[PDB]
Design a binder for this molecule. Structure first.
Ligand SMILES: *[C@H]1C[C@](C)(N)C(O)(O)[C@H](C)O1
Ligand SMILES: *[C@H]1C[C@](C)(N)C(O)(O)[C@H](C)O1
Ligand code: NA
Lengths: 7, 7
């Protein structure tokens, strides 16, 4: 990944 | 805020 969130 | 990211 490498992105974040939170979903 | 409250959500995340990262942009
Ligand atoms: C990350 C933060 C959030 C968007 N507030 C959440 O709690 O709904 C999610 C489950 O985790
Ligand atoms: C959060 C993580 C990321 C999406 N990889 C980024 O480094 O581009 C952003 C600036 O911070
Ligand atoms: Na904030």
């Amino acid at each position: 990944x490498x992105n974040x969130x939170y979903x």
